Design an enzyme around this catalytic site. Structure first.
Site, short mmCIF file in Angstrom:
data_model
loop_
_atom_site.label_atom_id
_atom_site.label_comp_id
_atom_site.label_asym_id
_atom_site.label_seq_id
_atom_site.Cartn_x
_atom_site.Cartn_y
_atom_site.Cartn_z
N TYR A 103 0.85 -1.21 -0.09
CA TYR A 103 0.01 -0.02 -0.05
C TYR A 103 0.92 1.43 -0.18
O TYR A 103 1.97 1.28 0.75
CB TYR A 103 -1.14 -0.10 1.17
N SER B 155 4.04 -6.56 2.35
CA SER B 155 2.65 -6.09 3.09
C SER B 155 1.51 -6.58 2.17
O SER B 155 1.34 -8.05 2.26
CB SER B 155 3.03 -4.63 3.39
N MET B 156 0.42 -5.39 1.63
CA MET B 156 -0.36 -5.83 0.91
C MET B 156 -0.16 -6.80 -0.31
O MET B 156 -0.92 -7.53 -0.76
CB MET B 156 -1.25 -4.45 0.51
N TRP C 203 0.36 -8.99 4.89
CA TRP C 203 -0.90 -8.32 5.39
C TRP C 203 -2.26 -8.85 4.61
O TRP C 203 -2.05 -8.54 3.41
CB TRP C 203 -1.07 -6.94 5.92
N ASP D 233 7.17 -5.23 13.93
CA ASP D 233 6.21 -4.63 12.83
C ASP D 233 4.99 -4.03 13.72
O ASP D 233 4.45 -4.68 14.41
CB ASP D 233 5.74 -5.71 11.84
N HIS E 56 8.48 -2.87 9.70
CA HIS E 56 7.53 -3.27 8.66
C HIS E 56 8.59 -3.28 7.30
O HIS E 56 8.08 -4.46 6.58
CB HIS E 56 6.50 -2.27 8.50
#
Length: 263
Positions: A59, A132-133, A157, A178, A209
């Protein structure tokens, strides 16, 4: 005997270096189809067709966050496409669709005589990575396409943590501290959900992260594990069985777990 084995026999030193044995070239995809933009990294004279890996950022992020994987993996015998999404605000499911779209364009470029990667790809052997995304999107890609041969998302995630249907060998890079996709509510529940595959959980000690992104301070270990995992499962290369399945036994790692990963 193994038709997918490429390159010199691996050592810890060669897997921990900034680049592997093969020289890497790269180009920008002229007309990206189904995603925002793409950079393709490929090795020169790898000794045969190689697998393809598609890597997606998170993201608000772009290729720069994940770009270091391109040359690192390509120098060991892979064609790697790093993508920008249509919008930096795209969700994991949209990221998965664009990730698979990128792999399909790599497959088509393999059959395009004008492309630098013409005839260089074994399009039957592909892998997915992302941050992440984009790591969540990689897990979705693996769940929706058991045809894939390996997955190695970092700090993943997604809205759901249930990926129990995944049969693709999956290495999860996690970052200990994170605060955006906390391990206890993301990476570790995702890892524990998978009981039908070879899997590994590698948590980076003190990592934020972005602990597996470009410019990180653990590129020797993270790069070694990424290449080893892709070699072991995309190439079925048992020369990498120890590198891929071993506990690094390093103070750089705060938590290591693995299952169905024999040395």
């Amino acid at each position: 005997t193994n038709p997918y084995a490429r390159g010199p026999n691996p050592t810890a030193a060669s897997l921990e270096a900034s680049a592997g044995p093969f020289t890497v070239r790269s180009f920008t995809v002229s007309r990206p189809s189904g995603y925002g933009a793409g950079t393709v990294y490929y090795p020169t004279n790898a000794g045969g067709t190689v697998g393809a890996i598609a890597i997606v950022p998170g993201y608000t992020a772009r290729q720069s966050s994940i770009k270091w994987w391109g040359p690192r993996l390509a120098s060991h015998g892979f064609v790697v496409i790093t993508i920008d999404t249509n919008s930096t605000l795209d969700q994991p499911s949209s990221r998965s669709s664009q990730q698979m779209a990128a792999l399909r364009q790599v497959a088509s470029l393999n059959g395009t005589s004008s492309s630098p990667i013409y005839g260089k790809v074994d399009t039957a052997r592909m892998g997915v990575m992302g941050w992440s995304m984009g790591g969540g999107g990689s897990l979705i890609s693996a769940a929706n396409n058991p045809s894939l041969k390996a997955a190695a998302p970092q700090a993943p995630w997604d809205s759901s943590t249930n990926f129990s249907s995944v049969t693709v060998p999956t290495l999860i890079f996690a970052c200990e501290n994170d605060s955006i996709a906390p391990v206890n509510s993301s990476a570790l529940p995702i890892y524990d959900s998978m009981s039908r595959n070879a899997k590994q959980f590698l948590e980076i000690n003190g990592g934020s992260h972005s602990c597996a992104n470009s410019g990180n301070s653990n590129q020797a270990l993270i790069g070694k594990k990424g290449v080893a995992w892709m070699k072991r499962f995309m190439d079925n290369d048992t020369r990498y069985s120890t590198f891929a399945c071993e506990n690094p036994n390093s103070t750089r790692v705060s938590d290591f777990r693995t299952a169905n990963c024999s040395l």
